[PDB]
Write an enzyme that holds these catalytic residues in place. Sequence first.
Site, PDB file in Angstrom:
ATOM      1  N   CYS A   9      -0.881   1.953  11.228  1.00  4.15           N
ATOM      2  CA  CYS A   9      -1.904   0.934  11.402  1.00  4.15           C
ATOM      3  C   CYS A   9      -2.290   0.814  12.873  1.00  4.15           C
ATOM      4  O   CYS A   9      -1.534   1.183  13.774  1.00  4.15           O
ATOM      5  CB  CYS A   9      -1.415  -0.417  10.882  1.00  4.15           C
ATOM      6  SG  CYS A   9      -1.225  -0.499   9.090  1.00  4.15           S
ATOM      7  N   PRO A  68       0.817  -1.216   0.000  1.00  8.22           N
ATOM      8  CA  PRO A  68       0.000   0.000   0.000  1.00  8.22           C
ATOM      9  C   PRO A  68       0.850   1.265   0.000  1.00  8.22           C
ATOM     10  O   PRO A  68       2.055   1.244   0.256  1.00  8.22           O
ATOM     11  CB  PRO A  68      -0.790  -0.125   1.309  1.00  8.22           C
ATOM     12  CG  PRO A  68       0.151  -0.844   2.220  1.00  8.22           C
ATOM     13  CD  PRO A  68       0.968  -1.782   1.352  1.00  8.22           C
TER      14      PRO A  68
END
Lengths: 446, 419, 85
Positions: free
Chosen positions: A245, A111
């Site tokens: 995250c 990503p």
Amino acid sequence: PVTNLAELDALVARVKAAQAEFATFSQEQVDKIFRAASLAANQARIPLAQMAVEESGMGIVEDKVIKNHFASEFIYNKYKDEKTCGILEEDDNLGTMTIAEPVGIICGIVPTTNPTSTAIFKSLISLKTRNGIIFSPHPRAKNSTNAAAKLVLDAAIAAGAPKDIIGWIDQPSVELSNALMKHDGIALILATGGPGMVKAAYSSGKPAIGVGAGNVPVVIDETADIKRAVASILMSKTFDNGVVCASEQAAIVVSEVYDEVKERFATHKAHVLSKADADKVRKVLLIDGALNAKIVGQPAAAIAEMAGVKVPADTKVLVGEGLGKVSYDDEFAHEKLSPTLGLFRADNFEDAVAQAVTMVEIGGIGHTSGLYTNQDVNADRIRYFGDKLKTARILVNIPTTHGGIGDLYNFNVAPSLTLGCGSWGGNSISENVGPKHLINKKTVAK
Amino acid sequence: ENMLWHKLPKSIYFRRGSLPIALSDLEGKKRAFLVTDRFLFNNGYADDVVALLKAQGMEVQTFFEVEADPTLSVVEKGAAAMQSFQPDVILALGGGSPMDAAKIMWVMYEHPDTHFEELAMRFMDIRKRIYKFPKMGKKAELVCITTTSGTGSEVTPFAVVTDDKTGAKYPLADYELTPQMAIVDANLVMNMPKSLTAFGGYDAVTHALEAYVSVLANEYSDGQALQALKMLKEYLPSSYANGAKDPIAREKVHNAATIAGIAFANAFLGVCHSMAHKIGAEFHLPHGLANALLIANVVRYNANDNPTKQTAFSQYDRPQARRRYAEVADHLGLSQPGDRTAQKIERLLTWLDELKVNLDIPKSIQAAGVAEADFLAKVDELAVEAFDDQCTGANPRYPLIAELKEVLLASYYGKPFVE
Amino acid sequence: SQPGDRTAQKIERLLTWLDELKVNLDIPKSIQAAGVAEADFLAKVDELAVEAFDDQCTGANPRYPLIAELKEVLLASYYGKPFVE
């Protein structure tokens, strides 16, 4: 150059033979390659960070530098010396011998949020386990990822490594990614990031695990000190515009200590919001129902003005209080991945617990949970709190990030990444990944 | 909570004419190896030690083939020569490279089987007490002699080694590298010239000043830090002006250097040290004055009221750096009795300004004889590569690479940095 | 030199040739550009010139120098100035 399926299968066969010869290598010789690669990766952390920042268009260079350093050092140190080649355990008196053997070909999906750190992570672990990997970089943040891949491949080459073990797409496309995802020759796939890709990778009829994160709630009760919680949450959220995250996504504030916590945010860069600009930002958080991407890693002023409002430039986070409702339709209820936050107004400890549970099922993954409370006077609260919640990480009076004073806060934690699961449905407590998942064991009895 | 430190080598013998009585106690030992530099080897200094050893009579050999920096090549030729000899005693002479290189070669001799890289990457920093180190000192064992006033490498468990092929710098740091035995005599260092005296003195000054305001600053460091700082202010100008006609200031400031070395061996160094290290690396500039030209801007960078931009954990252990500077200044008597913090800070850095003027250093990097073309060409990667150089670093406010270049250009140009 | 030339024409061509020839090899064109503190240059060029006179130059130099001209040349070269009269 890799842009079509013809050359795709060409380098598939190439790296296939390359891994075939690479998997015959002894431990004592793969170790020095391991060391040389880890060192070379840890050297040029900053050219890679600058490349990633400029290619992504957002983010903070120094956060990427420090996370590159931490990733490389931690992954080397925790996996310095582990028996991974040849015989593993023996029972000579029974003649039962158990060896390990590598898996083969794996795909890796990159990503834009962490395009370079995940690359070195997966590359080094694969090389440790004598296996091969192909990359599906995101079209946005790709050139940094490709450049890191060449750098690590070359550092391996000048160590006796085979001609290559690393493959990756050039100009990545959805059709190429699906063709390789359903390619026969791959043995595993590693998908991280957006929920759309992880479920599709799950729906592949092939082995797959996805490292993801949901809305991370923190509950603060009355016996909690206000200042310490506020400071810790602000540092953790301010880290890199909240793109890490398993980052905080909603706050539960109990009734009695509510308004002073709110004005405490008012006493700092946190800009509270209670008007139609809550709607002006709710539209821009959730444009398509699927997490508008024009706010990814963007500063508070930029997101405020694109919501249509002016905010004092010194602000860093926008605080939403129109969160009396608890369900998916709340834009705040979704994860934000931006310096934004919506809070809750709880009644008691148990109302807060129920609200926290209602948050945690929304993510679908039990990853992390935060409690800000007094520790020594309420251990009943601690253990009940642990009983009610189902997440991989439980923190009490602890930020959900990495790096405070000295070593690390906390020094004995894995990154918020590396925590994946083999399922997505519900209460899928994410787990860390190791070579035990990446090597297959066989045994013989005599 | 966390934990914190104070570990020192066991034994120091330290004075004017201490060397013979210092080495006297070395009777029962038999073998020995000597590390030093070729220049001092030519000078009538190594002969002194070897004669005192032959007075008891020791199988000895000197290694004077160390240059200004550890090589990753000289280290293993020396280690191989000595392990061919197999001594049980090792003596280090001088300042910097001869000592730590000795350390390295010795530890290489200690486990001649372990390879370099796993050691190098395994041990970069402390509070990373994961996990263990192979036992050392079983067969050979370390005694240290300083020559230069201004460095604390004689006491710190630190080393940095450079690749010859790539020029890669490897910091190794953990407490077993402290020599057992340290000696601080001054007859060796009486004729040393100016402003090499100034260079070492300012190096140590930087060390102390960063050590006190370090975020790792324990209660233990502050006393001796302030003591070295107090004593420097009266005997540096005399020693710089007078010597060896002044055999009072020179050994005293030598002791200050030792005290600082004691101090920051526990409270680690800061960003300015790393950037001085790098800038001296590329432009071949000596350490000691590279950092000296920086510190003003550094502190002007650090001295801030409350920018909560990259500060962390701010309010738990570190009250404020400004308070620390004010305490140093007023403790140093560098403030009018009725004063605010800021003007105390002003007086302090003005004091160090006129101080560095008194010891004849330039005011800007260009004034040091540095071209601006290559400076601007290299400063971009200089700031970035400085961001990560173990600095990390007890720096209370976290830096970002953007600020680094601003400071660098201000340094190259002069210009008090006030906002 | 052009086939139709006077001497001085050829001479300026000569030293122009050397001028951007030595340009080609990336060298400073004034000694200040070579990195010399010039205050002391002026301070000490005085005796520099006097020893520059008798330093074995003596010297097949066709013309006498005197102390003055050396000083002019030294300052002109340091500033990259053309010593011309």
